[PDB]
Amino acid sequence: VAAERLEPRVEEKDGYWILKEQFRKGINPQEKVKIEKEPMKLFMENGIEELAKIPIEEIDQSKLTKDDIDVRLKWLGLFHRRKNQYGRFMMRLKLPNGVTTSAQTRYLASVIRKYGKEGCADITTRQNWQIRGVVLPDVPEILKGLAEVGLTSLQSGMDNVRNPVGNPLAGIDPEEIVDTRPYTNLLSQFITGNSRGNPAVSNLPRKWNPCVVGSHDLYEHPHINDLAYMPATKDGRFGFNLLVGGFFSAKRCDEAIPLDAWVPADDVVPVCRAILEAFRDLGFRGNRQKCRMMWLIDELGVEGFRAEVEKRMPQQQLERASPEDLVQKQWERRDYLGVHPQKQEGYSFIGLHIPVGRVQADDMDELARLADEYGSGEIRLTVEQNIIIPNIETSKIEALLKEPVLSTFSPDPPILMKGLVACTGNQFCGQAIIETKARSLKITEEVQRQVSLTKPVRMHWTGCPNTCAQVQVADIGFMGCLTRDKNGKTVEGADVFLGGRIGSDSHLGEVYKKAVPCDDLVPLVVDLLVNNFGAVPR
Ligand code: SRM
Ligand code: SF4
Ligand SMILES: O=N[O-]
Ligand SMILES: [Cl-]
Ligand SMILES: [Cl-]
Ligand SMILES: [K+]
């Protein structure tokens, strides 16, 4: 790699970071959108106030404003559902470590309730909330309401640092390695500039996923993050070994690799900043399929990339990885659904199944009520799109288990439901090839009616090759496609994936059988379960 390749390609100008004049040749259309107008201005200079007043039909008549609502608004966490729910916006939060309060949950419920049949909410595969039904004129008030309850939606889409994932059992599990909440909180504060916006990290070449590990179970999926912090003691000091570059895409899926770097626990934010600065400064900005950070690491080599991180650290110090980390490889991933004792004597948490992560306003209010009556007003989200209510006095559990709402959001659903994960799909997502959430529930119910099993088989349904529902981590994955029935008629189908393993012995699954009509999946899946996962026909 020539020295010229290492010249930073962006510069700070008037509070924002912009591509230098000589580094604009050959850039992709999204890079052009970012040059034409700085997306962060919609929040940081309150551009949204006047934009929200323009009728959407008028907005669509000019490129600048159409790009504002379809692209730039994703820096404020607002996602126009142009194709499938025209004129409505999904809104996505920052929710480090998946932690919410009952007051926040009620606020979110109040927003979606206004929109009737156009509103609902979802738990995401980054243990985050999305709300639906939002209309542009309401955006300024919703932004204010979020701030009022201590939430932000900043920088949650497009070329930004995505939700910091941590251990859903942080602070409460007897078996935790280290409480991840202080670290994910710090990362979210850094990323969003304490909810004011942080332009230094909002003009990346592409999305970028961080997580902090605190569990032997590796609930945080460090192998598929751009930056994963692996807890490790080095020379008698607590800190983290760093994994970099994990990502999924239509073109390529790759597990994170060692940076060969250890940082003291206090250097979590400094090293996140250094890595993001290197990616921002040096990453390719052409073909969008080749802009994730792993492509930079491959171009420079991991050592070349490491040197770029090192030079951006305070005092330019970046120690080599600790020979061992704290994660025990002898481990069986633990079910968190149901009632479990906390490390705090006399307290339990309860994991509740949320079928395919989908809730309505009334459901959110009920869950918030349970969290207040039984817990400490806290609701935790998981990356399997479930919930945990922590800090419940154990003597209250008997009463809790009788609550009517638990017949719907159950502490002990059938085993295949416990592991079921499904993305948005074509109900709302414009890229989706198939419907996912209703279909996945229907097929899973039919499969479980036919077989019993004891292995915790994890089934993931994703609607298109973007693989937001991570089919490559599943025991059995389903990637949406169009295919043909016996008569040659167009039907919805799935490409079926096998081989995904999570935890310390992680492995990426691969296509097993392409183009299976969705109507033909039940017998295929039943046989796979019997033949490979010890399932027994009923
Ligand atoms: C909601 C969520 C799926 C879910 O049902 O849980 C989701 C939904 C969308 N993803 Fe995703 N992604 C979700 C996690 C993921 C993950 C999983 C993860 O982070 O562990 C991946 C794969 C891992 C990765 O990125 O390395 C993922 C890979 C993508 C990609 C492909 C990335 C790439 O490099 O090619 C896109 C398309 C893009 O960004 O160009 C994308 C694009 C989208 C959009 C924003 C597309 C669009 O605007 O319609 C989807 C919004 C649909 C909607 O209305 O909900 N989504 N997306 C997840 C929100 C996470 C969050 O809270 O921030
Ligand atoms: S995997 Fe495809 S269909 Fe599913 S939410 Fe992501 S972009 Fe939409
Ligand atoms: O929002 N999925 O990158
Ligand atoms: Cl996006
Ligand atoms: Cl769309
Ligand atoms: K779920």
Which CATH number characterizes residue 49's domain? 3.90.480.20
Output the six-digit token pair for 30: 């999204």
- Are residue 308 and residue 180 in the same domain, yes or no? yes
Are both 300 and 249 inside the same structural domain?
Answer: yes
Token pair belonging to 366? 């009920």
| Nearest residue to 510 (alpha-carbon basis) of 189, 137, 274, 248 | 248
What CATH number did the domain enclosing 328 receive? 3.30.413.10
479 lines ligand 2 (CB under 6 A): no
Nearest to 214, CA basis, from 257, 165, 162, 272? 165
Q: Are 46 and 166 found together in one domain?
A: no
Q: How far is the CA of 13 from the centre of ligand 5 (A)?
A: 32
Three-state DSSP at 239 gives: strand
Q: Are residues 499 and 362 part of one domain?
A: no
How far does residue 355's CA lie from ligand 2's centre (Å)?
18
Residues 6+ positions from 498 with CB-CB distance below 8 Å: 475, 476, 477, 509, 510, 512, 528, 532
- Domain holding 473, by residue range, is 414-538
Question: Do the beta carbons of residue 134 and residue 142 sit within 8 Å?
Answer: yes
Last residue of a domain, one of 317, 335, 353: 335
The separation between CA 298 and the C-alpha centre of its own chain, rounded to angstroms, equals 24
From residue 457, give the alpha-carbon distance in Å to each of 76, 85, 356, 518, 525: 37, 34, 15, 19, 11
Ligand 2 neighbour 431 (Cβ under 6 A)? yes
- Based on the domain organization, do 396 and 359 belong to the same domain? yes
In this structure, the strands spanning 476-484 and 459-462 are parallel
User: 475 C-alpha to center of ligand 5: Å?
Assistant: 30
Q: Quote the number of domains for the chain.
A: 3
Ion ligand 6: residue ranges with CB closer than 5 A:
354, 357, 385-386
Same-domain check for residues 350 and 430? no
Among 66, 31, 65, CA closest to 205 = 31
Q: Write the residue with the smallest CA distance to atom 45 of ligand 1.
A: 157
- In this structure, the answer to whether residues 144 and 61 fall within a common structural domain is yes
Method: X-ray
The answer to whether 431 is a known ligand-binding residue is: no
Atom of ligand 3 nearest to the CA of 468: 2
Which residue's CA is the closest to the ligand 3 atom numbered 1?
Answer: 157
Residue 269 CA to residue 279 CA, distance in Å, equals: 15
472 lines ligand 2 (CB under 6 A): no
Q: Which residue reads 């079910």 in tokens?
A: 335
Q: Assess whether 312 and 199 both reside in one domain.
A: yes
Cα–Cα distances in angstroms (integers) from residue 481 to residues 252, 433, 444, 470, 512, in the given order: 18, 6, 18, 15, 14
d(CA 447, CA 449): 5
Closest ligand 2 atom to 466 CA: 1
Q: How far apart are CA 58 and CA 87, in angstroms?
A: 12
The reply to whether 380 and 348 lie within a common domain is: yes
Distance in angstroms (rounded) separating the CA atoms of residues 146 and 93: 9
Phi, psi of 287 (to 5 degrees): -35, 115
Atom of ligand 2 nearest to the CA of 426: 3
* Alpha-carbon gap, residue 98 to 181, rounded angstroms: 9
Assigned token pair, 86: 């025209």
Judgement on whether residues 298 and 163 belong to the same structural domain of the protein = yes
